[PDB]
């Protein structure tokens, strides 16, 4: 049960040293050809017979549990009076009453004396664009009170488990991913990777790197 291409490497030291012997591994038949003195031969034979055991193999099942839970509450009320530049604005909330009141005035139909013109909602759309909750305006005689509320309750529960089977003391890679290329252009793999060099110990106690 062994690759002879690799066993010849080990027998090189047993070979010459013992003599103080040409061991050659013929890939094809996974048979290594020994040309020994008779003792050195009987010796290499006792070394190859003990290195040539079957290898057990481990089913490395990793079990990655990424469980993420997010909860946000934005609540914040903004008063504003643009006739006489009076805001109680907050940046912390989605939109600030300024953008919103300006946007609302631009979205109003102007008059250049007599023509009429319909204002662009391009400024109001840039304001309301970014409102992720509820940005309601109680317009009380020209004091626009934009009340904002959102209770963003996120939740994530990823449970990815990749197993690889590998021969003891063999290295085994596993990558379920994508090779994105990235400037430096190198192409780096980016996924669930798992690269275990599982090495089984006495007492059936696997020692993974």
């Amino acid at each position: 049960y062994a690759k002879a291409e690799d066993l010849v490497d080990v027998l090189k030291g047993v070979s010459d040293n013992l003599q103080a012997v040409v061991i050659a591994a013929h890939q094809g038949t996974n048979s290594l050809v020994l040309t020994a003195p008779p003792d050195i031969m009987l010796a290499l034979q006792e070394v190859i017979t003990q290195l040539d055991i079957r290898r057990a193999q481990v089913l490395i099942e990793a079990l990655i549990v990424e469980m993420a839970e997010g909860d946000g509450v934005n609540l914040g009320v903004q008063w504003g009076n643009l006739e006489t530049g009076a805001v109680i604005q907050y940046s912390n909330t989605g939109t600030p009453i300024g953008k919103v009141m300006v946007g609302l005035e631009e979205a109003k139909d102007k008059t250049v004396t007599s023509r009429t013109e319909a204002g662009d909602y391009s400024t109001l759309a840039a304001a309301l664009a970014g409102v992720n909750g509820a940005a309601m305006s109680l317009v009380m005689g020209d004091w626009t009170a934009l009340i904002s509320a959102v209770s963003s309750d996120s939740n994530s529960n990823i449970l990815s488990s990749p197993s690889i089977t590998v021969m003891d003391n063999g290295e085994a890679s596993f990558i379920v991913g994508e090779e994105v290329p990235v400037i430096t252009v190198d192409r780096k793999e980016v996924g669930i990777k798992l690269k275990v060099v599982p090495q089984i110990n006495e007492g059936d106690s696997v020692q993974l790197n």
Binding site: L63, V65, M67, N155, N157, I158, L159
Partner: protein, 50 residues
């Protein structure tokens, strides 16, 4: 492991909000390995019975 499993079983009591409560990933009982979703398990036995 048993702590995560607790959390996740929880999120199964208050299930995936609009989906069928069965799709929410839950770790299996420690050292039990996976159990098939119920529907499939129900199907499999039915096949076995047949």
């Amino acid at each position: 492991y048993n702590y995560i499993r607790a959390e996740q079983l929880y999120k199964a009591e208050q299930g995936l909000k609009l989906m069928d409560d069965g799709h929410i990933p839950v770790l299996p009982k420690f050292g039990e390995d996976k159990r098939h979703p119920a529907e499939i398990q129900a199907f499999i036995d039915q096949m076995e019975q047949q």
